[PDB]
Amino acid sequence: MQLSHRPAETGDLETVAGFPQDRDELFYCYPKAIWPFSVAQLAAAIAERRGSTVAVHDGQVLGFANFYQWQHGDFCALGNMMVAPAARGLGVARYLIGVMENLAREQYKARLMKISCFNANAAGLLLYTQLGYQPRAIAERHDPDGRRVALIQMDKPLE
Ligand SMILES: CO[C@@]1(NC(=O)Cc2cccs2)C(=O)N2C(C(=O)O)=C(COC(N)=O)CS[C@@H]21
């Protein structure tokens, strides 16, 4: 694996919007979005967020993430974490989370990264745990069917 990163570009949008494979996956990474996902929905998030970044390997965009909260000197909140379905479990999210930690430290002077993860996303919860994130709170949210879900609010000090 020889991963690189760069800011997200218009030409990446169709690729990245292809990453969520079902309503659950879209919910876990972008709960405000409505299935089916679209480039317009992805662009809307990019426009209102900061730091949208892609991970690339062998000419393929394999990952995407951004910040939906940012407070200089304080923290950033990382979301829209998406990984190409053929590249799952190969370290792309771990790589990109590390890049986003460096961005938060360097650009925003953040002392903390927040990551919130829905309860059903076991793989996410375990990944963020392996990367040193700890659970701080659990918040109630509602899914598209009106069912109650638990949002696990985690954080990690940045060094
Ligand atoms: C403002 O916080 C968020 N939204 C809400 O909590 C509001 C709602 C949630 C469910 C119904 S309404 C927001 O935006 N979030 C994102 C995101 O879109 O990136 C994620 C995805 O996180 C990752 N890890 O990719 C977790 S919920 C959190």
Dist. CA 95–CA 87, nearest whole Å: 12
> What's the token pair of residue 58?
């062998």
Binding-site residue positions for Zn(2+): 5, 57, 140, 142
**Structure-token pair, residue 19:** 């990453």
Distance, CA of 59 to CA of 4 (rounded, Å): 10
- Residue the block writes with tokens 């292809």: 18
**What contacts 62, CB < 8 A, 6 or more positions away?**
3, 54, 55, 56, 83, 84, 87, 92
98 phi and psi angles, rounded to 5 deg: -60, -40
Homologous superfamily assigned to 1-159: Gcn5-related N-acetyltransferase (GNAT) (3.40.630.30)
Nearest alpha carbon to residue 151 among 101, 107, 115: 115
Q: Which of 16, 30, 94 to mutate to test the pocket of ligand 1 (most atoms within 8 A of CB)?
A: 30
CA separation for the pair 114, 101 (Å, rounded):
10
Radius of gyration, alpha carbons of the chain = 15
| Relative orientation angle of helices 122-130 and 92-108, to the nearest 10 degrees | 60
Domain range annotation of the chain: 1-159
- Rounded to the nearest angstrom, the distance between the alpha carbon of 58 and the centre of ligand 1 is 30
Separation of 116 CA from ligand 1 center, angstroms?
Answer: 7
Assess whether the C-beta atom of 115 lies below 6 angstroms from ligand 1.
yes
Cα 121 off chain centre by: 13
The coordinates were experimentally obtained by X-ray
User: How wide is the angle at C-alpha 19 spanned by C-alphas 114 and 32, nearest 5°?
Assistant: 55
3-state DSSP: the chain helix, strand, coil percent, rounded to 5? 35, 35, 30
Determine contact, residues 152/114, Cβ cutoff 8 Å: no
Please state the three-class secondary structure of 82-128 as a single string. Answer: EECHHHCCCCHHHHHHHHHHHHHHHHHCCCEEEEEEECCCHHHHHHH
> Can you tell me the distance from the alpha carbon of 10 to that of 112, in angstroms, rounded to the nearest whole number?
30
Q: Which of 85, 62, 12, 6 is nearest to 42 (CA)?
A: 12
Which residues, in sequence order, are bridge partners of residue 142?
148
